[PDB]
Design a protein around this ligand. Structure first.
Ligand code: HEM
Ligand SMILES: *[C@@H]1O[C@H](CO)[C@@H](O[C@@H]2O[C@H](CO)[C@@H](O)[C@H](O)[C@H]2NC(C)=O)[C@H](O)[C@H]1NC(C)=O
Ligand SMILES: [Ca+2]
Ligand SMILES: [Ca+2]
Ligand SMILES: [K+]
Length: 336
């Protein structure tokens, strides 16, 4: 039954070219299968590509955007001028070349590169991968990307129009577990959003709940808040969603289990991958995606801080009993 040229076995002949682009991305784009800046950048690109989809604009007789159509690469000239798309240019060019060389659509390539990039980061789930999205796209309308200075109401409305419930917004933010910022405060380039920028874990949800104590750089950048320790950056939207009554209980439930967070994240990502498409018209090639190494560390409140330093914001469920660490407060090095 279906064998691909290099001897691997797959479900459909349409999956076979993806074994070649897998080898190309691991060796080159990811510099030997690493979980560093290329993965983090690609996670911003899959979001910004897919969120340019608005049912409300369509209802008002306007082009609403094509969703995960690869338009961020095909119309990079228009989309990378948007304020939330800076710092992406070099990754988008690298991706353009791989797509053109392999003859795969840009929309599919961005979904594939997200699943494969995440597989290089310890603790990640194996994300679903479907192929068949048309290469044809039109530029996304402006103003459909959530920004770090927006209120929780604005983020929930924009995300809700695209199709996400408040819970799914929180689930989607597990990608900030492999994250840093470059452009909000360039004095502290690549300052991490959690203490493990290379491990897909629960620490991001825990650490954003901790009382902001520290200013990590010479001044505060755009939409920057006080964070819990030296080297960590905290953006305002993340601080607010952690504490807002609409999202706070789901945020709190993401703090004690890497398995729960992983499942919820994979589900939310599978929904985002087909915005603008019919998943029943795509071919499933998830078996091409390899496993990530497992994360064996327990969720912890870092460097001596206790449950008394968490700003518990879910009034109905008590805070999970998480482990504490007998250490001094951490200073975080830049994300690699
Ligand atoms: C819904 C609200 C969201 C907002 C307001 C937001 C905002 C931001 C901002 C301001 C940055 C820093 C960019 C820079 O200066 O370098 C960032 C980084 C990042 N975000 Fe989000 N984000 C959101 C959702 C997401 C989602 C859904 C994903 C993907 C599934 C994502 C993945 C990341 C990653 C991985 C980075 C790190 C990039 C790097 O280290 O270079 N974000 N986000
Ligand atoms: C998907 O469509 C894009 C946009 O038309 C195609 O990209 C162009 O590809 C040619 C080579 O065939 C390059 O010289 C151009 O520079 C590309 N343009 C852009 C904006 O990237 C791409 O080839 C199409 N891919 C497939 C598989 O059809
Ligand atoms: Ca798009
Ligand atoms: Ca992490
Ligand atoms: K679960």
């Amino acid at each position: 039954s279906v064998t691909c040229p290099g001897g691997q076995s797959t479900s459909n002949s349409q999956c076979c070219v993806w074994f070649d682009v897998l080898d190309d991305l691991q060796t080159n784009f990811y510099q030997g299968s690493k979980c560093e800046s290329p993965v983090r950048k690609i996670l911003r690109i899959v979001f910004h590509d897919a969120i340019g989809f608005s049912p409300a604009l369509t209802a008002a007789g306007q082009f609403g955007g094509g969703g995960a159509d690869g338009s961020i690469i095909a119309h990079s000239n228009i989309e990378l001028a948007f304020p939330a798309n800076g710092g992406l240019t070099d990754t988008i060019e690298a991706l353009r070349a791989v797509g053109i060389n392999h003859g795969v659509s840009f929309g599919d390539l961005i979904q594939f590169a997200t699943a494969v990039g995440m597989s290089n980061c310890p603790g990640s789930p194996r994300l679903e991968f479907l192929t068949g999205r048309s290469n044809s796209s039109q530029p996304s309308p402006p103003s459909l990307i959530p920004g770090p200075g927006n209120t929780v109401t604005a983020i929930l409305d924009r995300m809700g129009d695209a199709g996400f419930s408040p819970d799914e917004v929180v689930d989607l933010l597990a990608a900030h577990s492999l994250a840093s910022q470059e452009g909000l405060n360039s004095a502290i380039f690549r300052s991490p959003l959690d203490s493990t920028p290379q491990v897909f874990d629960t620490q991001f949800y825990i650490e954003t709940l901790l009382k902001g104590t520290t200013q990590p750089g010479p001044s505060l950048g755009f939409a920057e808040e006080l964070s819990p320790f030296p080297g960590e950056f905290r953006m305002r939207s993340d601080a607010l969603l952690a504490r807002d009554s609409r999202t706070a209980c789901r945020w709190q439930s993401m703090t004690s289990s890497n398995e729960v967070m992983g499942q919820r994240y994979r589900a939310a990502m599978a929904k985002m991958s087909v915005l603008g498409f019919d998943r029943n018209a795509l071919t499933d090639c998830s078996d091409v995606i390899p496993s990530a190494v497992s994360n064996n560390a327990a969720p912890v409140i870092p460097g001596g801080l206790t449950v008394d330093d968490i700003e518990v914001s879910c009034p109905s469920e008590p805070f999970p009993e998480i482990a504490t660490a007998s250490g001094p407060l951490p200073s975080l090095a830049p994300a690699p």
